[PDB]
Amino acid sequence: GTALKRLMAEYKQLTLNPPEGIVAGPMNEENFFEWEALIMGPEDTCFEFGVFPAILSFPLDYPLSPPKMRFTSEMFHPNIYPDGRVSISILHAPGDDPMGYESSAERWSPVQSVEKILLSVVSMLAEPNDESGANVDASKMWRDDREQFYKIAKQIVQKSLGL
């Protein structure tokens, strides 16, 4: 199908020309609709050098609809739900939650790509913003007690490395 052909093509490109600090691909090539991504927090940001695994689950009509994405280890970020689900503009078409994200942020369409999703997630990790309320406690503590948020961010980084 076109979804499988498209996911196979994106995987080929990602393996040929990998983006910095990210490894991603199907957990097993007999099911290209379930990928695992490993993302490192960029230097000089809140979660710098942390290593964060996530699962991308693609819909049957990909690339017309975006995947769902979920971190599978602990996170504490205003835009990541407590169960790990990622809440960013690029993972939604212009029609769903049309105002729940920044007007400047790109929406899903077939010209987007897995590479563009993961780069957007990296930016989100670097630049937490408390105006998507996916994690209420994280958004409030980002707004009201950022020192405590920073302390937790550093613990999360250290645990993600086992140190």
Partner: peptide
């Protein structure tokens, strides 16, 4: 082949974690 691709993906994920540890400890 699918087999080699899959083992290479595992190797590269292991290596990403090892590199992150290096950079974290050198900072």
């Amino acid at each position: 082949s699918a087999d080699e691709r899959q083992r290479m993906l595992v190797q590269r994920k292991d290596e990403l974690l090892q590199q992150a540890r290096k950079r974290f400890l050198n900072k």
